[PDB]
Design a protein around this ligand. Structure first.
Ligand code: NA
Ligand code: NA
Length: 317
DNA sequence: CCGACAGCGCATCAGC
DNA sequence: GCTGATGCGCG
DNA sequence: GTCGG
């Protein structure tokens, strides 16, 4: 059902970037994915209506699509110079719905206009403009692996008590990723507790020219650009995030940023039946009254599986 | 019917 | 200068 | 836009 999900995704993107209606966005998105997993060529709006996340208005749009091959509303959207321009601009990192809108109002509409108007771009936006094409590219797995070995080894060289894990679709074993997401921790950093834990690692990664640009950086989160070394033809630049997490919240962190999103959802749901609440930071027990107690000591991803009485599940699954 | 729908780190800005 | 609000990405 | 209380 690629026609229906593409229609929907377009609707989702139009709501997010142009309408600035984040909930309609997520609703269209939820609907698409749900329809992705449906093992039959949808024949009617009503049919899809049965799905969770598919309601009356979408079932109606599905009928119109099936019947006419197109969606009238989507058509008019694409024909509207302002909507399409705003929609395109948001593809630049650091340009969200607010900036895109403001740019199209003053006649700034294209990549070329941005380059002509770099005087009006913040640092994040310039970098986003700069690597516009590379950021939309997928990172094939074998490159992730290469990138991993470098981060882990450079982190190893700074301080070897540093623990680092590359999460995301990658840890679940995907053949490609959109960026690199790295969780870092250290015995000296805890809920209760150093000045430059993240810095030394960010810095050390600049020393060997792996990290090439900085979008943001602070005591706990770094957002930036990296690139693999080449012999021969050069690699695309990639987005990399690095999170510094306290050691007593690291595995909850690892569990969270490993996903999937749908999976986490089921874990939390299950965790409830058993009398535990799980967030990005901690697992805590619930009193009979629904009152969370203190966070429980987690020394591994499995500890969490143990608490909520679940068969430990390997990231791939 | 009507509110909820993730909300957090960092960069930047408005308002003092 | 200082504090809190907002935009953004991420998810 | 869809859900659920
Ligand atoms: Na139904
Ligand atoms: Na973007």
């Amino acid at each position: 059902n690629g026609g229906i999900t593409d229609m929907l995704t377009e609707l989702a993107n139009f709501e997010k970037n142009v309408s600035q209606a984040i909930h309609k966005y997520n609703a269209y998105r939820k609907a698409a994915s749900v329809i992705a997993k449906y093992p039959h060529k949808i024949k009617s709006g009503a049919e899809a209506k049965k799905l969770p996340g598919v309601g009356t208005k979408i079932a109606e749009k599905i009928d119109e699509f099936l019947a006419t091959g197109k969606l009238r509303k989507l058509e008019k959207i694409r024909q509207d110079d302002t909507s399409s321009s705003i929609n395109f601009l948001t593809r630049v990192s650091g340009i969200g719905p607010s900036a895109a809108r403001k740019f199209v109002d003053e006649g700034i509409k294209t990549l070329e206009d941005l380059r002509k108007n770099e005087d009006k771009l913040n640092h994040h936006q310039r970098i986003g403009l700069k690597y516009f094409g590379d950021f939309e590219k997928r990172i094939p797995r074998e490159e992730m692996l290469q990138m991993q070995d470098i981060v882990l080894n450079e982190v190893k060289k700074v301080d070897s008590e540093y623990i680092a894990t590359v999460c995301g679709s990658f840890r679940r074993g995907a053949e490609s990723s959109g960026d690199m997401d790295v969780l870092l921790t250290h015995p000296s950093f805890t809920s209760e507790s150093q000045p430059k834990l993240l810095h030394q690692v960010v810095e050390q990664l600049q020393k060997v020219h792996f990290i090439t640009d900085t979008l943001s950086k602070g005591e706990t989160k770094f957002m930036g650009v990296c690139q693999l070394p080449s012999k021969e033809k050069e690699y695309p630049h990639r987005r990399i995030d690095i999170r510094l997490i306290p050691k007593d919240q690291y595995y909850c962190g690892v569990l969270y940023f490993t996903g999937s999103d749908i999976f986490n959802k089921n874990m939390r749901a299950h965790a409830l039946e058993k009398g535990f609440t799980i967030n990005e930071y901690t697992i805590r027990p619930l009193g009979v009254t629904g009152v969370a107690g203190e966070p429980l000591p987690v020394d591994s991803e499995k500890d969490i599986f143990d608490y909520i009485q679940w068969k430990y599940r390997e990231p791939k699954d």
